[PDB]
Design a protein around this ligand. Structure first.
Ligand SMILES: O=c1ccn([C@H]2C[C@H](O)[C@@H](CO)O2)c(=O)[nH]1
Ligand SMILES: [Mg+2]
Ligand SMILES: [Mg+2]
Length: 144
């Protein structure tokens, strides 16, 4: 019965190591996500980081795991995967890619990504015989 809304999102800690998501500025797009454990993201490699949080993203939205800009510029860290469905009730994981040539060390509590509650539509699909014509048309992949 009790469901998240755009104004109030429900979060459950799955262990004593989880840190609640928190926005770092007044109008920050995302909630900072902290690692629940120590990890090493190998050079040119990847690592799935557990937050030990379960989140109920409000219906009409999804949660996008997104990169922190400092770790991207300084450490060549990117976020893979990243689509968290509003019906997902498992452990929120952050998939990190390390494109650099040095390992990237993560300690428990380090903020290693952010979580953006992005508004979406979930339309029904109708197969049609023709689509409306536009100026763009089939122009894609570097037309403009
Ligand atoms: O970065 C990601 C991508 C996916 N998932 C989970 C939630 C999502 O609903 C499910 C299937 O993509 O896996 C995560 O925890 N993190
Ligand atoms: Mg990308
Ligand atoms: Mg899927």
């Amino acid at each position: 019965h009790h469901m998240s809304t755009p104004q109030l999102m429900r979060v459950k800690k799955l262990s004593e190591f989880a840190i609640l998501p928190v926005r770092s500025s007044q109008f920050a797009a995302g909630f900072d996500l902290a690692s629940a454990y120590d990890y090493v993201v190998p050079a040119r490699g990847k690592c799935l980081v557990k937050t030990d949080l379960a989140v109920a993203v409000p219906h009409g939205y999804y949660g996008r795991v997104a990169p922190r800009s400092g770790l991207a510029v300084k450490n060549f860290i990117d976020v893979g995967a990243g689509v968290v469905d509003s019906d997902y009730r498992g452990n929120l994981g952050v998939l990190l890619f390390n494109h650099g040539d040095e390992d990237f060390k993560i300690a428990r509590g380090d903020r290693i990504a952010q979580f953006v509650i992005e508004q979406i539509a979930l339309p029904d699909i109708v197969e049609v015989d023709d689509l409306d014509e536009t100026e763009r048309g089939a122009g894609g992949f570097g037309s403009t």
